[PDB]
């Protein structure tokens, strides 16, 4: 397809990686050595005491927090030859995960969704994890993530993670990424619930605006999801040469979860769609009731007006000398079809 | 025969930049004759021809280099997309300019064509106007490697200008999508829907202009023919980039007018019932009035009241009580 | 531990020459664009050169375009602005500023500067 | 080139108020513009990016949008550290030129 290049862009210089992101705040770095028996972390701000971990026996976990520093990343990804593009990749946040196997590492792109109850935003960020010999590179924006379980596990030696070498340290950082997914799928669940019970109750437009938000989102979901599920089908079925054999049915388990995980978002999908045409209804409903409001209005009284100005004109010749000279009678006849088309609205039960 | 397809015929004329390593060599003239011999020169030759509309000249200029009539009728074919054919002595693009008016939000387009020879290069366009003037300046004032290379250079940095404008275009959509944001979130407006169709409309034109330069920037470097050479393919490679580059923000404009349509289109049914309620507010609380005032306005005799306790007083009274009680109805209800 | 030092500034005849250096320590002057702004006295900033040191990229003012020449020294750590064919208007206290780039859209990107040294003072009179 | 044209060019105001500086741009400048505080005798700093963003270490009174071809400074609780002078600056081309200032003193 390509020779894997770079992109050589317009208004800007031809060496440069740019940061395309809005988070600029934190910058940190994790590192987190552990083996069979021994165990040590600490946090970093100079990259120059993470760089000796690229050679080494112990499996490494790296983790570089703010990636808006693009000199530690173009550092880091020297160090551990990692080719421009992907280092490119790295820093472009505009673009949908994936997976891309080179002959010394592979480099996969995943996104995290933290959901906001206040508000019902959306957000994202990139995380990007290249898996070396022994070592897992992760990269982020901000402070904060899903991966704790994981560092407890390795904390005090819970689960078989110690055993095993960085290919299963990539299927617990994979794992747990995909499985806050539920979280996120299961905090939108009451949302939609209280969306229910609103628009039963009360239409207007936030509700519109509420219901619109819902459905932007949730296309957003399924752009995230479906790009995952297809980048853990190919770590499955393709079997790399830096991931052994052993780590194939865990890979097999997540992409399973991920199948429901994408049927649970298509039924919350359809069901607002209903919500929607549940709003519609009842908004027309009351339209209905005023127009039935103003209708009966115009029905009884255009006829009476117009009778009160055909006996209101002025001719030469009236009928007023007879009948005892009907103004009362008039009356009653006013009277009389107003109740005839009241009587007649009641029969068709017209509220 | 040749029949020109569009718009403009009001000018016409010839221009003609040859140059060289030694020296440049320009004329602005107007018959086709004094044009025609500079095919066979070893220099790079640039020929510019402002009118198409006069087929004559278009039809004479194509006979002598040896262009097939299919690209005579191509050129002369004003409503059409962009697309790039190879031949064996030359190669024939097509590309499209925009004017772009802020005052007047219309996305107007003129069509160029592009006959790359051997060490000539013809140029066809309809109008007055064009993106070259920076190609212009580097050819008269030695401004870049652009003399010291042959005509492959020449289409380079043609193309090149026009994506150029294409960014400039391109900014001034962005402040127009970012002054309609709020326009159309903050408030809204009987002009601001128009505006938003339109803006749409003229991201369509763009999208569907955009995407065939990209796929012949991608046909001119990736498949390479014998006239592009080698040295140039990085050129056009960077080009391909810049279209991409453009291609993208395309898009995404593209998303937001579209999210901008989607909220208003949305807020529609709540402000049917909100005019309704105004409209059977106005009507309930006057035609029972008017009638209360008609039916008193009778030309009867023997109407009981001719002055009984000030009748046109009470009257009025009667007036201020249904409409107090009806003003106070719907509010206890909330129309 | 990020900072920028200026040096060079002086009392030079008209038409004179020198060399301006901005020393930069706590980060790699390959890794981000290098800007000089200067600021006649009770005027305001204006902007005059600027270098990619990686790329060798240099944009220039009009008002000292021909006439300066901005560089890099990757080894050094540090960049150079030249100040030749000098008038007694281009006096002023030269500062060294430090830019990153961000994304606004595909098409557009823009550099805002970070830090800056204190600057020093460059006169062209007598 | 581009001209920042911003106004006002001075302002005197107390401590509380809400002060709006404007910067207009000779033609579209695409959110590329930055804002930045200079001090007498001191470095200039960095206050807002791409006209909306708060560069970090930022107070939150400080604040900045756009509207088209204009940019707005924004300054809701006006404090005695504030009283600088102001600059627009824009980046959207290589050749990236300032504003003439605005000098915020007491009023």
């Known amino acids: 397809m390509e020779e894997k290049r770079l992109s050589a862009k317009k208004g800007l210089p031809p060496g440069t990686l740019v940061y395309t992101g809005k988070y600029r705040e934190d910058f940190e770095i994790e590192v987190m050595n552990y083996s069979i028996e021994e165990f040590r972390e600490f946090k970093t701000t100079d990259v120059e005491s993470v760089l000796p971990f690229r050679d080494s026996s112990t499996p490494t976990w790296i983790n570089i927090t703010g990636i808006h520093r693009t000199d530690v990343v173009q550092r880091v990804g020297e160090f551990f030859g990692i080719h421009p593009l992907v280092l490119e990749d790295i820093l472009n946040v505009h673009q949908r995960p994936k997976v891309e196997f080179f002959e010394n590492y592979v480099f996969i792109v995943l996104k995290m969704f933290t959901y906001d109850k206040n508000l019902h935003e959306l957000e994202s960020e990139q995380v990007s994890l290249i898996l070396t010999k022994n070592c897992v590179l992760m990269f982020q924006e901000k402070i904060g993530d899903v991966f704790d379980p994981v560092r407890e596990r390795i904390r005090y030696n819970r689960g078989i993670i110690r055993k095993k070498r960085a290919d299963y340290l990539l299927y617990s950082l994979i794992d747990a990424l995909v499985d806050d997914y539920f979280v996120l799928l299961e905090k939108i669940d009451d949302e939609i619930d209280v969306l229910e019970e609103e628009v039963l109750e009360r239409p207007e437009k936030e509700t519109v605006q509420r219901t619109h938000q819902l459905k932007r989102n949730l296309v957003e979901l399924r752009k995230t999801i479906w790009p995952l599920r297809e980048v853990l089908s190919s770590l499955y079925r393709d079997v790399p040469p830096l991931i052994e054999k052993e780590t194939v049915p865990y890979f097999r388990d997540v992409y399973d979860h991920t199948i429901q995980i994408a049927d649970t978002v298509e039924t919350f999908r359809d069901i607002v769609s209903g919500l929607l045409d549940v709003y519609l209804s009842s908004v027309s409903n009351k339209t209905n009731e005023v127009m039935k409001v103003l209708t009966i209005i115009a029905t009884i009284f255009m006829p009476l007006t117009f009778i009160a100005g055909i006996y209101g004109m002025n001719f030469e010749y009236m009928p007023e000398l007879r009948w005892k000279w009907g103004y009362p009678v008039v009356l009653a006849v006013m009277g009389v079809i107003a109740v005839i088309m009241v009587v007649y609205f009641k029969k068709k039960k017209w509220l | 025969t040749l029949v020109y397809t569009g718009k403009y015929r009001e000018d016409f004329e010839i221009e003609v930049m040859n140059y060289s390593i030694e020296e440049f060599r320009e004329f602005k003239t107007t018959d086709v004759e004094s044009v025609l011999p500079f095919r066979d020169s070893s220099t790079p030759t640039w020929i510019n021809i402002t009118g198409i509309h006069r087929t004559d000249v278009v039809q004479r200029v194509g006979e002598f280099f040896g262009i097939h009539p299919l690209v005579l009728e191509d050129i002369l074919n004003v409503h059409q997309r962009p697309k790039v054919e190879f031949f064996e002595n030359y190669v024939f693009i097509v590309l499209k300019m925009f004017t772009y008016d802020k005052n007047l939000h219309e996305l107007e387009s003129e069509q160029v064509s592009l006959i790359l020879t051997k060490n000539c290069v013809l140029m066809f366009q309809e109008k007055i106007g064009d993106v070259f003037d920076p190609v212009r300046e580097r050819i008269r004032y030695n401004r870049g490697i652009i003399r010291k290379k042959r005509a492959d250079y020449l289409l380079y940095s043609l193309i090149d200008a026009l994506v150029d404008d294409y960014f400039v275009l391109l900014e001034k959509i962005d402040d127009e999508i970012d002054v309609l944001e709020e326009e159309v979130l903050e408030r809204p407006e009987k002009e601001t829907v128009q505006r938003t169709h339109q803006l749409k409309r003229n991201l369509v034109e763009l999208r569907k202009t955009i995407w065939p330069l990209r796929e012949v920037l991608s046909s001119l470097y990736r498949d390479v023919p014998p006239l592009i050479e080698k040295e140039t393919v990085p050129y056009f490679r960077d080009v391909y980039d810049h279209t991409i580059q453009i291609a993208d923000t395309v898009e995404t404009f593209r998303d937001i007018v579209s999210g901008l349509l989607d909220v208003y289109l949305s807020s529609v049914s709540n402000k049917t019932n909100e005019v309704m309620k105004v409209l059977t507010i106005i009507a309930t609380i006057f035609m029972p009035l008017t009638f209360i005032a008609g039916i008193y306005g009778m030309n009867f005799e023997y109407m009981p009241e001719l002055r009984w306790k000030w009748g046109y007083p009470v009257v009025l009274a009667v007036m201020g009580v249904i409409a107090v009680i009806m003003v106070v109805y719907f509010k206890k209800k909330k129309w | 531990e990020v900072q920028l030092v200026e040096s060079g500034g002086g009392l030079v005849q008209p038409g004179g020459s020198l060399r301006l250096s901005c020393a930069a320590s706590?980060?790699?002057?390959?890794?981000?664009?290098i800007h000089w702004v200067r600021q006649a006295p009770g005027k305001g900033l204006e902007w005059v050169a600027s270098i990619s040191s990686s790329s060798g990229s240099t944009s220039y003012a009009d008002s000292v375009k021909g006439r300066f020449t901005i560089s890099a020294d990757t080894s050094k750590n540090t960049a150079y602005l030249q100040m030749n064919s000098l008038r007694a208007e281009d006096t002023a206290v030269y500062y060294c500023?430090?830019?990153?780039?961000?994304?606004?859209?595909?098409?557009?990107?823009?550099?805002?500067?970070?830090?800056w040294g204190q600057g020093t003072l460059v006169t062209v009179s007598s | 080139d581009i001209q920042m044209t911003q106004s006002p060019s001075s302002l005197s105001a107390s401590v509380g108020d809400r002060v709006t500086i404007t910067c207009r741009a000779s033609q579209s400048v695409s959110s590329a513009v930055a804002w930045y505080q200079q001090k007498p005798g001191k470095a200039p700093k960095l206050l807002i990016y791409s006209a909306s963003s708060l560069y970090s270490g930022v107070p939150s009174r400080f604040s900045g949008s756009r509207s088209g071809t204009d940019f707005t400074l924004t300054i809701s609780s006006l404090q005695p550290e504030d009283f600088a002078t102001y600059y627009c600056?824009?980046?959207?081309?290589?050749?990236?030129?300032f504003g003439q200032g605005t000098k915020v003193e007491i009023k």
């Open positions: 500023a430090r830019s990153y780039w961000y994304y606004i859209w595909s098409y557009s990107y823009g550099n805002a500067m970070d830090y």
């Open positions: 600056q824009q980046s959207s081309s290589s050749l990236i030129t």
């Open positions: 706590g980060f790699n002057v390959s890794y981000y664009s």
